[PDB]
Amino acid sequence: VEVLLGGDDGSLAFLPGDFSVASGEEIVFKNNAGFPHNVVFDEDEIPSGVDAAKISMSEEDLLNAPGETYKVTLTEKGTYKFYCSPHQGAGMVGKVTVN
């Protein structure tokens, strides 16, 4: 699945923001507008036994140009909350269910 970071109008949203994937399906986050953006998983809101540090972007790594991507693959079934660090207070948060 591909997820855009920001609407074209600069709206601070993942598109789509709540979605489902199969275990082992790749998630392509594509930087769109309103950046900088990144993708960090909330370690309190992902399945047991998953280390959020392996699937989250590095804290200083921000996507700052159109079309840059971050790709991640999730295998443990369950629901995962993630967010964009700079825009988390503005509502830029999303959820992926892995089945």
Residue in 87, 93, 94, 96 annotated catalytic: 87
Q: Which of 55, 92, 93, 98 binds Cu ion (CB under 5 A)?
A: 92
Q: Which of residues 33-52 bind Cu ion (CB under 5 A)?
A: 37
DSSP string, 8-71: TT----EESSEEEE-TT-EEEEEE-SS--B--EE-TTSS-TT--HHHHSPPTT--B-STT-EEE
Q: Which is nearer to Cu ion, 30 or 87 (CB)?
A: 87
Q: Which residues bind Cu ion (CB under 5 A)?
A: 37, 84, 87, 92
Annotated binding site for Cu cation: 37, 84, 87, 92
